[PDB]
Design a protein around this nucleic acid. Structure first.
Ligand SMILES: Nc1ncnc2c1ncn2[C@@H]1O[C@H](COP(=O)(O)OP(=O)(O)NP(=O)(O)O)[C@@H](O)[C@H]1O
Ligand SMILES: Nc1ncnc2c1ncn2[C@@H]1O[C@H](COP(=O)(O)OP(=O)(O)NP(=O)(O)O)[C@@H](O)[C@H]1O
Ligand SMILES: [Mg+2]
Ligand SMILES: [Mg+2]
Ligand code: NA
Ligand code: NA
Lengths: 658, 658
DNA sequence: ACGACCTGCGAGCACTGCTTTTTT
DNA sequence: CAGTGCTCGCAGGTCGTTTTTTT
């Protein structure tokens, strides 16, 4: 449509980035400087002005929510936004592998494991190894290796003779045996979503070429929190036409603990020596006051690229800090002030509370509840992570794929029905010699070489299952989930122990209703049940299917509660950062890691601060409760860093020193 | 109504007996001589001629069937038969005790034990005693003692130092402890029906006097097979007005094995020296031929009152014997011959088959079934004795009487439901210290001493029971038995194991239909369900509630199959006596007792023979199978006794001597 | 606080012997 | 046929570890 007018909506530098077009380009700019805004315009300009087809554009965001929100804002500038490919790296790996996984041994209908699934496999494999040792420790090494794009052999030659507390080679062994067992189940994990796609593109160059036709102009936001495997994925993708534009801010890199590699963004002009580089200097988000506090804070980190971050707004309402006697007084001080400011005109949805750890939510929730301030909890106890839901989702996995063993393992027991704690072991070894088909072991229980005591109990389960499978061979997702819930015998259990079980079956109802809202959605026209489970498996804390599911019964236009980490990318007129304490911000872990630990936490704190547009209120306590015990608390060292740049305050409005 | 005409319907001697009136009278006559006929006429004559009120007459028969049949025949002769009191001794014991048992500590709603109930009590009591030994051996000593009218102390002074194989004093102890336990349950047994009534009449002379107004003219049939307890009951009853007429034949005394005392009848005039004695000399039942065989047979017994038994009919068809190679050939020979005679004109219901033991019925049944000759089995597997029935009747006992422990014990685990085997025990001692009520223990399980690990299971049973008790507090027996069968969970068990279970639930349906037919009867107008259980408890082999229930689906006008014992009193134009073998008739038991054993068996055989009116066919085998093995068979010694008086015969018509 | 471990109870399934003398 | 013995399934209890952050 000739595009949106750049120089109308952007400053000249933003506008020249948005006008970039072909070849590698790197956009590097401090917080609140309009990196994401420039991205949105760039996408509309490629289409409007350079006549790029939407179905040739890929934009990779940190969360699907962030991608939905970009897409929409792009539709306001230019037609055809519906056709843009926009998602996380992991969501793209699903889409690529679902389409092309058969070129590298992934049979169609492969299953995507969750963390509980990974432990079934681990416990199963670790027995014979020189590895006491907790299955989850092993799981942590494997995830991290995959983020690093390491094979087991690679891990054998890794730097440290000890990983967590394990011998390097025992760890590699574990990983290696987990790998065989996981492939024997036609299954893959979260990190495989990235590593397998990379393997696909290297092994099958004609496949890379086909995908490059849809990913001809590549955009990647949050490039600072990219890992080696995502790095390598992006390289392969761009390798042909080299239309790669990345955007990020090294001061806001807060995922090293999980694999993020800040050198991806700092080496970009080395890896693409023909890149254009655009640097935004002006923050548009924040009051000049919160900004000065931000800049003086981040100047304490060392080895950082010094970049200009200059204010455009005036120095607004001053920044404040409050130390409460108690975390409970913190509670009340937050809860009280929400009102005052509401009373003065700011809507609930323009205010947020940020905390270092999810444990700190509980007290805050109750403090707003008491005063009935509506609350919206992001990233709390995940709804697709509850036992009830995964149990039903397991029944669903097993129905589509009768050869899925870890699914069986999880629900053969619940409800109880002649579960062979002894018997299952026997069906398990029986299956391996015959071949790993465990569900078939149950059907062949009465007829073949048998397990004596409860042969029939197996058969009945085999028949219960085929009825589900026949009900999945066609017959609708939301109602198929009713089929499973009813006939499995799951509901009548929860009703007969319906005390906390009513709480549990109340959630099972939501599942059907989610499966329903999803079915009746725009993008899911003719969507399979497999498709539903795919989406449910890939949700971020900030995604709709999660926030709605978990805040059901809450109004929108509520106060938002989340971690400092989930705040990445967002912005609010009013921000409360709570628990600014040595031991929390920075965490004890980061303290124990030395300067490089502290520097990560400082970035985290810097993110928190630069979330606020009009007012920032930080608080701390002198005492706080851990799991059952109360200990004295100290201010964060980070407050020392920004002394002189905020006012200390008592429960009421006014001045205190410190 | 002026009565029936005696001299029209009876010979002069019979008529003068039928005309007796006041004071003791003894009628003593051989088989087929019209003792029972005279009794029937005498009853009508007391009413018609002497103006005795029916409600003043008592006639004690050996079975309720025999009493129904007398009553009816009396109704043809005189109005007011409906009001006569006619029954067995044991049935009269129930009526007397139900009315007056509270005068001797029997609280209303006392329960009548069956043989399974007795064993519950036995096993419970014999633990501590110098008694290995089977609970049923003890049970047999107790029953015998009661028939003798012995107390435990009496048994301590009894003749033999060994009873069965027990020391005399351990047996008396057993009996003595059984007694306490049985009374602690407000319960009584079958023999108590006679001994407690006797105790009632001795302890409470005003009660005897009230009953004597209904039993003013007493009649007793089969007086030869009365035991001492019955002997003493009759004496008490007659002690005031002394209008006692007894009828019997010592040649047909066949119950010594159970207590019968032949001296009751032989001493009647020592006991009533002012008695009149009537003796019938003429048999009216039998062909002169079967009669000569009977007489020559009985003449072998010694020390018997030698009385005239002269024929009135002509020497009809000759009596025959057949030896068959097999019991199977016996089967076929009986089966084949039933038809011949059927073909010649005899109806099925004019023919019967008599065997020493109930085991012999199986082969016979099948032989008639093969040739589809309709069969009616008397005294086979008792219908009110099957497990399913006593289970439901136990539920019913418990509903009426929540304090019945034996009932509880039997069904607390039918169906299963936290049948605390260990819990029961813990439930049992709980109740002992607090007090007998075991059902309360189950209700008090959540509360109090806390029978744990399944507390609720007990409570739910206590609740299931109150619902039955509430449903027995009012409502209909036939539909209350539905209530029990449904809600107990009994039916859905038998349906879920409905294989031989369908055979078992088919029977449960008959129960409701019996319960119903009984309700809709003439005498049970406004009948309690307690009343129903009373009647079911007191059936003889020959009684309607039993034969109908056990031959359901069979036509009437069928061939009758029963033991020689159950033939007492009856008559048939055609009689087959099978298995006339040494070891059977006489039994090994009788053989081992010496001449007094042989003499009892000879009486038994004499009864069999004098059942036949027109034709008697006896058979024996050379081989026979017991339970597994097959052994050689030998003719009965009794055939030697009657040689010259029957024809030996081939499977066809005529002679094969031997 | 959370599951991953233990003690003990219920019950189903099999192994094993006189069932058969007669029954109010 | 029943009375008895062996082994298996499942609950109601106990204990130590929880989280640092999460695509
Ligand atoms: N040229 C501009 N004119 C007006 N508002 C702007 C301009 N550039 C950025 N903004 C606003 O500044 C705020 C932050 O922009 P955003 O594009 O979210 O910055 P970012 O660099 O992408 N923020 P962060 O991801 O947290 O480092 C938004 O509310 C934008 O609307
Ligand atoms: N005076 C009679 N006239 C005709 N038939 C008679 C006469 N007396 C007896 N009977 C018949 O003979 C058969 C036997 O009579 P019953 O009154 O049954 O004898 P009982 O002495 O009571 N028999 P039992 O009990 O087996 O020793 C019946 O069929 C009677 O009808
Ligand atoms: Mg941004
Ligand atoms: Mg008679
Ligand atoms: Na595209
Ligand atoms: Na009477």
């Amino acid at each position: 449509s000739a595009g949106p007018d750049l120089l109308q909506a952007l400053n000249p530098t933003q506008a020249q980035a948005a006008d970039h077009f072909t070849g590698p380009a790197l956009v590097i700019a401090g917080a609140g400087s309009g990196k994401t805004r420039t991205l949105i315009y760039r996408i509309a300009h490629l289409i409007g002005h350079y006549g790029v087809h939407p179905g040739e554009i890929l934009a990779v965001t940190f969360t699907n929510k962030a991608a939905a929100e970009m897409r929409e804002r792009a539709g306001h500038l230019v037609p055809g936004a519906g056709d843009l490919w926009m998602s996380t790296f992991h969501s793209a790996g699903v889409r690529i592998l679902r389409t092309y996984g058969e070129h590298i041994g992934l049979r169609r209908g492969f299953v995507i494991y969750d963390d509980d699934d990974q432990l079934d496999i681990i416990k199963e494999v670790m027995g014979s190894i020189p590895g006491e040792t907790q299955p989850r420790v092993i799981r942590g090494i494997i995830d991290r290796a995959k983020s690093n794009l390491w094979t087991p052999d690679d891990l054998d030659r890794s730097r440290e003779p000890f990983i967590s507390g394990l011998p390097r080679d025992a760890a590699a062994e574990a990983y290696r045996r987990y790998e065989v067992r996981k492939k024997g189940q036609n299954a893959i994990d979260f990190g495989d979503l990235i590593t397998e796609t990379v393997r696909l593109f290297k092994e099958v160059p004609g496949v890379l070429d086909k995908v490059q036709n849809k990913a001809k102009f590549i955009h990647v936001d949050e490039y600072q929190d990219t890992n080696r495997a995502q790095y390598e994925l992006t390289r392969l993708l761009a390798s042909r036409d080299r239309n790669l534009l990345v955007v990020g801010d090294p001061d806001q890199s807060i995922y090293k603990f999980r694999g993020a590699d800040i050198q991806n963004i700092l080496d970009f002009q080395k890896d693409y020596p023909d890149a254009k580089v655009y640097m935004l200097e002006h923050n548009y988000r924040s009051s000049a006051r919160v900004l000065e506090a931000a800049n003086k804070l981040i100047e304490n980190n060392t080895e950082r690229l010094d970049k200009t971050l200059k204010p455009v707004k005036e120095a607004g309402q001053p920044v404040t800090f409050h130390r409460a006697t108690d975390h409970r007084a913190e509670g009340d001080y937050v809860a009280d002030w929400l009102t005052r400011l509401h009373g003065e005109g700011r809507a609930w949805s323009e205010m947020a509370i940020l905390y270092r750890t999810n444990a700190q939510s509980r007290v805050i929730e109750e403090s707003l509840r008491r005063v009935q301030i509506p609350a919206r909890i992001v990233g709390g106890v995940g709804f697709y992570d509850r036992r009830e839901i995964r149990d039903i989702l397991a029944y669903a996995r097993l129905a589509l794929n009768p050869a899925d063993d870890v699914a069986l393992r999880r629900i053969i027991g619940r409800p109880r029905r002649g579960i062979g704690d002894t018997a299952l072991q026997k069906l398990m070894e029986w299956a391996r010699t015959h071949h790993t088909s465990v569900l078939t072991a149950c059907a062949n229980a009465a007829e073949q070489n048998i397990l004596d005591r409860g042969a029939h109990k197996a058969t009945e389960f085999a028949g219960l299952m085929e009825a589900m499978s026949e009900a999945a061979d066609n017959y609708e997702p939301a109602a198929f989930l009713r089929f499973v819930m009813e006939t499995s015998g799951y509901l009548d259990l929860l009703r007969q122990e319906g005390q906390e079980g009513q709480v549990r079956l109340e959630n099972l109802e939501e599942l059907v209703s989610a499966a329903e809202e999803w079915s009746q959605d725009e993008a899911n026209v003719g969507g399979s049940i497999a498709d539903f489970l795919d989406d449910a498996a890939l949700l971020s804390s900030v995604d709709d299917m999660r926030t709605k599911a978990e805040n059901k019964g809450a109004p929108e236009d509520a106060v938002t509660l989340m971690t400092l980490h989930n705040a990445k990318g967002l912005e609010f007129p009013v921000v409360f950062i709570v628990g600014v304490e040595q031991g929390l911000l920075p965490s004890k872990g980061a303290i124990a890691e030395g300067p490089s630990g502290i520097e990560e936490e400082r970035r985290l704190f810097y993110v928190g601060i630069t979330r606020a547009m009009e007012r920032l209120l930080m608080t701390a306590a002198q005492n706080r409760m851990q799991f059952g015990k109360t200990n004295a608390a100290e201010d964060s060292a980070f407050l020392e860093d920004i002394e002189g740049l905020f006012d200390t305050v008592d429960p009421y409005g006014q001045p205190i020193e410190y």
